[PDB]
Structure 1
């Protein structure tokens, strides 16, 4: 987390719809999905986001 990145993540998914972790990271200047996954799963635990297990895509809920 660095630092309110979850806010940026939230804006991207809100404006671009359901996207995989790799696309989210690249849209924020990062390289791999590992750079944002701990954030995504932290937001998911707080019911901010949710992931479709089939498409591995993250969306706002």
Structure 2
């Protein structure tokens, strides 16, 4: 295929992926502030949604969100 591989539903998910592609693995709180949110809970919905579709992966060790391969 000649087009890009991931699927985003909204601007948040698209920013989350692009952000973690550009800096590498970061915690949900880093992602939240980078979108202009306040808390890790404001992003967690988008973050876990992308993990459920093969786009993100959280680390159990420090809650570091890393783009799924």
Query: One fold, TM greater than 0.5?
Result: yes
Distance 2:21 2:60 in 1: 19
Q: 1:45–1:35: structure 2 CA closer, same or farther, 3 Å change rule?
A: same
CA distance in 2, matches of 1:29, 1:55: 22
What is the count of residue pairs matched by the alignment? 61
Structure 1 residues 3 and 58, CA gap change in structure 2 (3 angstroms): same
**Segments of 4+ moved more than 4 angstroms:** none
TM-score with structure 1 setting the length: 0.91
Corresponding residue of 1:33? 40
Question: 1:2 Cα shift?
Answer: 8.7
**Which one has a bigger Cα radius of gyration?**
2
Compute the displacement of 1:55 (Å): 1.4
Unaligned runs of 5+ in 1: none
Q: CA separation in 1, counterparts of 2:54 and 2:10?
A: 19
TM-score in terms of structure 2 length: 0.81
